[PDB]
A paper describes a structure:
SOX2 is essential for the neural development, and the self-renewal of undifferentiated embryonic and neural stem cells. SOX2 is one of the key factors required to convert somatic cells into induced pluripotent stem cells (PSCs), and in concert with Nanog and Oct4, plays a central role in embryonic stem cell maintenance. The localization of proteins to the nucleus via the classical import pathway is an active process and requires a cargo bearing an NLS to be recognized by importin-α (IMPα). Humans harbor seven IMPα isoforms (IMPα1–7), each containing an N-terminal IMPβ-binding domain (residues 1–70) and a C-terminal NLS-binding domain constructed from ten armadillo (ARM) repeats (residues 70–500).
To better understand the mechanisms of how critical signaling regions in SOX proteins interact with nuclear import receptors to drive nuclear transport, we crystallized the HMG domain of SOX2 (comprising residues 39–127) in complex with different IMPα isoforms. The 2.3 Å resolution structure of IMPα3 bound to SOX2, enabled the entire HMG-box domain and NLS regions of SOX2 to be reliably traced from the electron density. SOX2 bound IMPα3 through an extensive and contiguous interface across ARM domains 1–9 of IMPα3. However, we found instead that, SOX2 residues Arg40, Lys42, and Arg43 were bound at the minor site (IMPα3 ARM domains 6–8) and that SOX2 Arg57 was bound at ARM 9, outside of the minor site. The C-terminal NLS (NLS2) was bound in the major site of IMPα3, with SOX2 residues Pro112–Met120 bound to ARM domains 1–4. Overall, this structure showed that, these two distally positioned NLSs within the HMG domain form a contiguous NLS interface on IMPα3 through ARM domains 1–9. The IMPα3:SOX2 interface was mediated through a buried surface area of 2034 Å2, 14 salt bridges, and 34 hydrogen bonds. Although the overall structures of the IMPα isoforms were very similar (RMSD between IMPα3 with IMPα2 and IMPα5 of 1.5 and 1.9 Å, respectively), we found that the ARM 7 domain is positioned differently in IMPα3 compared to IMPα2 and IMPα5. In contrast, the ARM 7 domain of IMPα3 is set back by 4 Å, and so provides a favorable interaction with the HMG domain. In addition, SOX2 cis-Pro44 is also positioned close to the ARM 7 interface. These two prolines lie at either end of the SOX2 HMG domain and facilitate the extended interactions with IMPα3 across ARM domains 1–9 that are not possible with IMPα2 and α5. Here we found that IMPα3 bound SOX2 with the strongest affinity, with a KD of 102 ± 15 nM (mean + SD, n = 3), whereas IMPα1, and α5 bound with significantly lower affinity with a KD of 447 ± 27 nM (P < 0.0001) and 247 ± 30 nM (P = 0.0017), respectively.
Author numbering:
A (entry chain A): 67 to 485
B (entry chain B): 39 to 120
Write the structure that this text describes.
């Protein structure tokens, strides 16, 4: 399509004083840029059409010319960072922001889309478009009287406003967006709901201060129930989002637990999808890495048998997370809490992972067993027998010749103190 | 001082230092080891922190790629196609 038409003639006709000739040239540029997923962005940039397309955005007298030019610029900005930057250096963003107030719906939507690609390029462009004032008019589009297809585009732009972490979006911007996400999290459309939660998952992955902004918005009680949502794409997005929150402080982890998050995990731990099981255990591992009250919460939720059950006869990925969840409990748990773990037959499946090829897993499991023995001082002999009965002591002794320094050093030390 | 995964630069650095500090000073409590490690982290230069910063970024990238619905994630840039 590019090899069979004069780009120069397009560029020169796009600068013509005749509106009909101009529109046909911009339309041809749009079709060149939107006929497939590999358009000739560089050739049209090099031809000098960017200043012409940008100028077309100002022509309020020709909404069709604004629409076609915004469409052309949208797909140019959809490319690499170099091609997106070319649009930014053309000073198109202030004109896109003006077009957000256009009375013509397609001109607004296309301006929204173009701004979304620019915001999604990185934190610099994101903050640039934020600083010019994109958030206020963007969120004003969110109403009951917005076409669903437009609202999907609006939510996608909001996702990009939350995306990058170095640095994260400004505090004031996060605080403006969260009330809108509170509205959108109740939407029935799956595409909007999934995007709303993904936006939350990016905010909760931006640091403990951003996690606190999410909590202070009041939206966490509305995110947690989505762990049992009928659409699996909503569940996994919500599971990662809340999983990011419990990577924060103990106080932030407790907020999630106060929303009865653990109630949704029996179903998650028995879910057919193995990756959802692995994710649900990674979540719980960050809970058992908390304080004693949070270890107790996992106990009271009847999840310990299910974690031990998944540790045994589970897929390799989930067993690794289960080992982390168990070992973390030996670090944070009280004597009675590790005692309850023992009573539930944790030693055979825990020791069965001493033969895994992953060096990190063996290290994590050996640390857990070490903490178990050190915790039951009076009954260390009884636990040493339990380790021996299931063949664990044999596997520890084989690990005395392991290649890793921390593994064979600890294996000898464990045997010196308790065997 | 909690260790949540994926770990940040300080947490991966503390992981190695914790074990050494425990052996060298067996009469030191876990709370005091965390306090000193957090303070000693402030003395490190950017060059000494860089390996642990790159590891934390590496762990973060894997954590996102291992998202159950990674393929169905919202993309940063999209085209308006015909």
């Amino acid at each position: 399509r590019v090899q069979n038409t004069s780009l120069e003639a397009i560029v020169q006709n796009a600068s013509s004083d005749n509106q009909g000739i101009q529109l046909s040239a911009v339309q041809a540029a749009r079709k060149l840029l939107s006929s497939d997923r590999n358009p000739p962005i560089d050739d049209l940039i090099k031809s000098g059409i960017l200043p012409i397309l940008v100028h077309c955005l100002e022509r309020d007298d020709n909404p069709s010319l604004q629409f076609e030019a915004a469409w052309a610029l949208t797909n140019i900005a959809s490319g690499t960072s170099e091609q997106t930057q070319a649009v930014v250096q053309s000073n198109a963003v202030p004109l896109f922001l003006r077009l957000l107030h256009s009375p013509h719906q397609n001109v607004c939507e296309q301006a929204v889309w173009a701004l979304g690609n620019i915001i999604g390029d990185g934190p610099q462009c994101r903050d640039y478009v934020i600083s010019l004032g994109v958030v206020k008019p963007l969120l004003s589009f969110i109403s009951p009287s917005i076409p669903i297809t437009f609202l999907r585009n609006v939510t996608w732009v909001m996702v990009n406003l939350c995306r990058h972490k170095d640095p994260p979006p400004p505090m004031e911007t996060i605080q403006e967006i969260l009330p809108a996400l509170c509205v959108l999290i109740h939407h029935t459309d799956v595409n909007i709901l999934v995007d709303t939660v993904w936006a939350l998952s990016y905010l909760t992955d931006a640091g403990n201060e951003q996690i606190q902004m999410v909590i202070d918005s009041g939206i966490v009680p509305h995110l947690v129930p989505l762990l049992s949502h009928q659409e699996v794409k909503v569940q996994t997005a919500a599971l990662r989002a809340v999983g990011n929150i419990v990577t924060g402080t103990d106080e932030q982890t407790q907020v999630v637990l106060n929303c009865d998050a653990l109630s949704h995990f029996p179903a998650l731990l028995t879910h057919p999808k193995e990756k959802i099981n692995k994710e649900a255990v990674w979540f719980l591992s960050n809970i058992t890495a908390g304080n004693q009250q949070q270890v107790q919460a996992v106990i009271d939720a009847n999840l310990v048998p299910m974690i031990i059950h998944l540790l045994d006869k589970g897929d390799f990925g989930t067993q690794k997370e289960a080992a982390w969840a168990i070992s973390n409990l030996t670090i944070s748990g009280r004597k009675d809490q590790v005692a309850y773990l023992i009573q539930q037959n944790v030693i055979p499946p825990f020791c069965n992972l001493l033969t895994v090829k992953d060096a990190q897993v063996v290290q994590v499991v050996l640390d857990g067993l070490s903490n178990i023995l050190k915790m039951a001082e009076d009954e260390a002999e009884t636990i040493g027998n339990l380790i021996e009965e299931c063949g664990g002591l044999e596997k520890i002794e084989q690990l005395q010749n392991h290649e890793n320094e921390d593994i064979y050093k600890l294996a000898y030390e464990i045997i010196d103190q308790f065997f | 001082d909690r260790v949540k995964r994926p770990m940040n630069a300080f947490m991966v650095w503390s992981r190695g230092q914790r074990r050494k500090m425990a052996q060298e000073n067996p009469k030191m409590h876990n709370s005091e080891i965390s306090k000193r490690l957090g303070a000693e982290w402030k003395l490190l230069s950017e060059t000494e922190k860089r390996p642990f910063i790159d590891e934390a970024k590496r762990l973060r990238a894997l954590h996102m790629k291992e998202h159950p619905d990674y393929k169905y994630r919202p993309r940063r840039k999209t085209k308006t196609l015909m």
